[PDB]
């Protein structure tokens, strides 16, 4: 039927029309694109028609001449360019009459401007665009909507195309646009679209930047245009700044002295939230580019060489008149505010903390007074705001400096611990976390430390917003107190710590505080299970007692849960209950691998009854099957080779967990408890290995899996085959031919997404021929008749680590794995692998490589590797 | 009282998988590709009195984008979603906000770092610097752990509404 008609269909909210609409199009475009570009066009061109109509037919043509991935807007450039010339000159006219007939406020015509231009002009087969553009701008008598359109569509051609092909004519752009931008103009939104043209074309005249009265002139209009009574130009003006100081930073020394410097401060001034925000983005991105900055001056010094850009420290010279104007917008509160309201007081606050990171110790002398004088002011704004900026201020400076000013103003944070106003408090407790996480050594202080603990075990008593920030600085303090352990000792654990004298009322306040009713509000009950996982994880020997009744809790609990199963009633409690499995479980593996092996012993009999009875409740594909299956893996390292009671119960759950391979993560968990088995059977998993190893064979090709499940696989195939020794010869060449499948496979080295993909499948590979030769080898005795199996995959093993070795990305894993690897096949095979090393010579290359390589490990066993090969080099 | 939203991002980074958690509640955990669009109404009470988004879930793949951009049209609320725990994900923010504003005029635009539950970020919190450039609100989500889950969706009725005063009363 009509186009218009599907065209207006393409908005409303059905499944079945949207469908049909989405199909007709799809058909229309397959079956003749000239055709249907051409009536797109005289959609799009007529004024008559319905604004929803002509955006759809503009996006149309638009989405069918260009696309977000390159190669197929580069295919449909082409398909546009095969296209006969009368088509397309009659599609051209129709969309460049179509600018200025639009009411709507975004220009809609101007993308299918942007989409013809970006394949008609590096053919130049449209030399009438920009002579037609630059006379629509500046004509006096153009009409507002003109103007605008025109603006518009310079922006979106001067943004997607690219900037190789109107470099010749951009002065005549830059022309139009600050004829534009100009103060003359009459009409607001021609300035908008003026500003944010040029916004847009800022990537684009760079070599046009690079003249110094062109780059005059734009500093001159906008520092203009900054000025201007409407709000929105001042908001587009400053963005332009801010998108100028990006790219160009190195010109605006001349300019940023007498011009920006106080249009900026006036900007932060502003009571408006939108100018001041703005400004304090602006020197948010000052600090920004001084910090990049000095990071690649660092680089360059390391290198022995001048930076390429070299900063002026603006923010450091202009700290005197920053820092006041911060503060006092840090003021700028209300009874009701949320933390991340992105306000310009949020806005301040991390403007302050960018200003610290970037100066260090001269933010210090210019904000002390401030905290000084209203520390105890009887307004609660400003020692809100002294509280804040004291807290923002921790992070850069150094700790040395700021340990004086911790330790005397904490009575005064403990005080304010208990402030009758809620902000107050939240900002304390705020302060407090970051005290504990930045500088630890002042929270751990003799002669402070039992009044803040009080403090603490009181506030977990507070409001969820302060409990949260209360027990994240509980966590942190109890990393810190046990980095600070362990006085001589010389073990692998504290006899005791500082938080030794109140572990057990802490985790009993933590256990109540995991009850509290209104712990879904601010992920209390999620921050407190983190504080105690970390408490328990951070725990001395001395606390052992107090670890076991809280693993019996736990323990308790999720028997409740087992309990409870009848109890599902709604969707939004039984989501809280898997909720809680899943906190419940990751607690189990948090505190089980802090108990004795004895200890454990008589409650791995009731968890293995909890987890076999929740595996029968998720026996159907899924449901959880992910936290349980690392609980059971964590129970599998705490019991070692008594596992074997329960594994012929487990086996049809782990069966299943192989076969569904839907979830990456659980089919990622379910190997690693393969792995995990494994390691702690040794041998006595070859009745289950011919079952795992068939399941793993089905889920090996299987071309609809994810990413990162294939080296989890390839792991434990190496895991497998050590465990087994020279067992696994059943499936041996299978595996081999499945693994040499996969080697020969190669992606593409552009995009870094694959590039650790491809990384970790490489390190897989040699970690399971590592495995397999280490299986086939036996333990102690000389070379074995098993791996003569492997003896002519020796010379693809070492094809295929030459052809990684010619990459150059790399990393540590795999240049450690392939020194094993090498390190293996030497004391497998003799000379024949070191000949075949010596052929070719990027492996002495990497092996040079991983001796430089700063890891101790890889650097370990590539000296271990060629020490092998001067071995064999000495034995013949 | 209805408004019109739209949820943008990469390939799966996490849409389908949030308006599935705050429709029903039940987190689910295969990976399914969104076929084009998908329109479902989010129903909230608030104290003066309930609201509905009908959240377009656009699809995040080039093969079934479908109109792509042309859902866009007449939007009112814009919610750039992006997995933390890819990186790509994150760049190809600007792209999708670029789209928004092409065809937007005025609308409030809301990021939002999706599966932060993960314990190692490969995007941190210092890093996301995109919403102080455009003027734009950002949350720390995750739709398996329910961080900040209602957060998105409490900043946009304060805004469309203009009240500061309003509370899910839940
Ligand atoms: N850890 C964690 N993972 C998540 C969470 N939410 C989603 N995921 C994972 O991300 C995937 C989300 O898939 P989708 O949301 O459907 O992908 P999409 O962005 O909608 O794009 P389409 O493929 O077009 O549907 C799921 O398979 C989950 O495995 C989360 O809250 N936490
Ligand atoms: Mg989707």
Known sequence: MELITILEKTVSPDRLELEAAQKFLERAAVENLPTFLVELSRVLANPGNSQVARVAAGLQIKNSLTSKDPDIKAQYQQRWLAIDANARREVKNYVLHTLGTETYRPSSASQCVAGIACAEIPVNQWPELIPQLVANVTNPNSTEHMKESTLEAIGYICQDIDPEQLQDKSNEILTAIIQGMRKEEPSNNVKLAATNALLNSLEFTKANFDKESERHFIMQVVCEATQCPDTRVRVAALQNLVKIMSLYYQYMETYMGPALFAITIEAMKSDIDEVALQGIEFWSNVCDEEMDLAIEASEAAEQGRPPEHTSKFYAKGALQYLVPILTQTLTKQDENDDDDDWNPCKAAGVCLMLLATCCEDDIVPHVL???????????????????????????????????????????????????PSVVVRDTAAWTVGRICEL??????????????????????????????????????????????????????????????????????????????????????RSSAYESLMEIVKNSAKDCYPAVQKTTLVIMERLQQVLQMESHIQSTSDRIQFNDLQSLLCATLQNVLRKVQHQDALQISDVVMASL?????????????????????????????????????????????????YAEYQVCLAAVGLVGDLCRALQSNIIPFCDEVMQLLLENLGNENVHRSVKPQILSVFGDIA????????????????????????????????????????????????????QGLKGDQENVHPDVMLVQPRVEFILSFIDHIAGDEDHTDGVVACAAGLIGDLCTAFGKDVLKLVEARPMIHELLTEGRRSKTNKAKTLARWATKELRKLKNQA | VQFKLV???????????????????????????????????????????????????????????????????????????????????????????????????????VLCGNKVDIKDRKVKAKSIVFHRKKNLQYYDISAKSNYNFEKPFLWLARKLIGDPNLEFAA
């Open chain 1, 369 to 419: 007074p401030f905290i000084k004088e209203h520390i105890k002011n009887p307004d609660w704004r400003y020692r809100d705001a002294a509280v804040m900026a004291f807290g923002c201020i921790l992070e850069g400076p150094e700790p040395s400096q700021l340990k004086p000013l911790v330790i005397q103003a904490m009575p005064t944070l403990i005080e304010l611990m208990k402030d």
């Open chain 1, 439 to 524: 500088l630890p050594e002042a929270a751990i202080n003799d002669v402070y430390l039992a009044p803040l603990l009080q403090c603490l075990i009181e506030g977990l008593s507070a409001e969820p917003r302060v409990a949260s920030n209360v027990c994240w600085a509980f966590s942190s303090l109890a990393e810190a107190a046990y980095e600070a352990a362990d006085v001589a000792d010389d073990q692998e654990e504290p006899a005791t710590y500082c938080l030794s004298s109140s572990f057990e009322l802490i985790v009993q306040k933590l256990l109540e505080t995991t009850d509290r009713p209104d712990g879904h509000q601010n992920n209390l």
């Open chain 1, 612 to 660: 076999l009875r929740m595996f029968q409740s998720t026996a159907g594909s899924g449901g959880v099957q992910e936290d349980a299956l690392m609980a059971v893996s964590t129970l599998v390292e705490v019991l070692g080779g008594e596992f074997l009671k329960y594994m012929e119960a487990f086996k049809p759950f782990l069966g299943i967990g192989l076969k569904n």
């Open chain 1, 722 to 773: 050590l465990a087994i020794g020279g067992e696994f010869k059943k499936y041996l060449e299978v595996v081999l031919n499945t693994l040499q499948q996969a080697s020969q496979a190669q992606v593409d080295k552009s995009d870094y997404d694959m590039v650790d993909y491809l990384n970790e499948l490489r390190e897989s590979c040699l970690e399971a021929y590592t495995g397999i030769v």
């Open chain 2, 7 to 109: 949820l943008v991002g990469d390939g799966g980074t996490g849409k389908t998988t949030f308006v599935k958690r705050h429709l029903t509640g039940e987190f689910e955990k295969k990976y399914v590709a969104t076929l084009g669009v998908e329109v479902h109404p989010l129903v909230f009470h608030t104290n003066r009195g309930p609201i509905k988004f009908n959240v377009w879930d656009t699809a995040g793949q080039e093969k079934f984008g479908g109109l792509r951009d042309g859902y866009y049209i007449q939007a009112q609320c814009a919610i750039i979603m992006f997995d933390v725990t890819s990186r790509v994900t994150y760049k190809n923010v600007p792209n999708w906000h670029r789209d928004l504003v092409r065809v937007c005029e005025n609308i409030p635009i």
